Amino acid sequence: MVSKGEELFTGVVPILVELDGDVNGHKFSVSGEGEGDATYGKLTLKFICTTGKLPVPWPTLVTTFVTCFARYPDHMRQHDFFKSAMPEGYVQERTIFFKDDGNYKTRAEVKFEGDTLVNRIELKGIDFKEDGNILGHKLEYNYNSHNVYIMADKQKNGIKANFKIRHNIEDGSVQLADHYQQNTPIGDGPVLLPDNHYLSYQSALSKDPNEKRDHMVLLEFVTAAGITL
């Protein structure tokens, strides 16, 4: 049978993203809009910095900007915590430690408002070097594929993950962003607590040639894979 959560994602779902950020005291906001198609694990989103110039590089916000759109293969459906929490939704929290630089702390609520899947985020960044790779805008505008190991967090009735993102720099090195993540449901309803599994990501960043505002276009695919060999 198709679960309550699963049925909310059988077609194309509009997405709205709102972020309020503050990094080393530099305040900024970003809105995003687009669509998710969970059947294909597909996200298409365009983000606009509504406060002027984004004071951090767009790539550093990609992981922050809706894992309910992941494609879970049929044999993996029991492990999809993210859809099981809908429509009431879940809180996603991270600390992202940039190696040799500062860290982001994020809190996002992901939930439906009517037919729209909303990702509402607050982000606070501290201890950044004003001329480091982040505040100095030294990251290439691109993105690597990454696998994320999702684990159940029984104590907290949700999931957790930690993974390292590599942001390429043009001198051939990378800026590491070490993610520690915890998701917990917003409703008191039943959720799926998964066995350990992976989510495989690819992300492509681009620009709208007709857009004068500071912005990012993101195309991202997420697919789950199991550990039964």
Q: Which residues bind Br ion (CB under 5 A)?
A: 50, 57-58, 67, 92, 94, 106, 108, 126, 222
Closer by beta carbon to Br ion, 1 or else 186? 186
In the complex, the smallest distance separating the C-beta of residue 101 from Br ion, rounded to whole angstroms, is: 13
In the complex, the smallest distance separating the C-beta of residue 114 from Br ion, rounded to whole angstroms, is: 21
How far apart are alpha carbons 54 and 94 in whole angstroms?
20
Question: In 10 A of CB 132, how many CB atoms?
Answer: 15
Closer by beta carbon to Br ion, 19 or else 229? 19
In the complex, the smallest distance separating the C-beta of residue 164 from Br ion, rounded to whole angstroms, is: 16
How far apart are alpha carbons 221 and 123 in whole angstroms?
23
In the complex, the smallest distance separating the C-beta of residue 229 from Br ion, rounded to whole angstroms, is: 25
Q: Which of 21, 20, 184, 19 has its CA nearest to residue 91?
A: 184
Closer by beta carbon to Br ion, 26 or else 77? 26
Please enumerate, as own/partner, the contacts of 157-160 that have beta carbons within 8 Å and a separation of 24 or more.
157/184, 157/185, 157/191, 157/193, 158/81, 158/90, 158/182, 158/183, 158/184, 158/185, 158/191, 158/193, 159/81, 159/183, 159/193, 159/194
In the complex, the smallest distance separating the C-beta of residue 172 from Br ion, rounded to whole angstroms, is: 18
Closer by beta carbon to Br ion, 119 or else 152? 119
Closer by beta carbon to Br ion, 67 or else 133? 67
Closer by beta carbon to Br ion, 1 or else 199? 199
In the complex, the smallest distance separating the C-beta of residue 119 from Br ion, rounded to whole angstroms, is: 8
CA distances from 176 to 31, 97, 144, 167, 205 (A): 26, 8, 12, 6, 18
In the complex, the smallest distance separating the C-beta of residue 165 from Br ion, rounded to whole angstroms, is: 13
**DSSP run (H or E) holding 117:** strand 116-126
Closer by beta carbon to Br ion, 67 or else 175? 67
Q: CB under 8 Å to 224, separation ≥6 — which residues?
A: 70, 71, 72, 73, 76, 79, 80, 197, 198, 199, 200
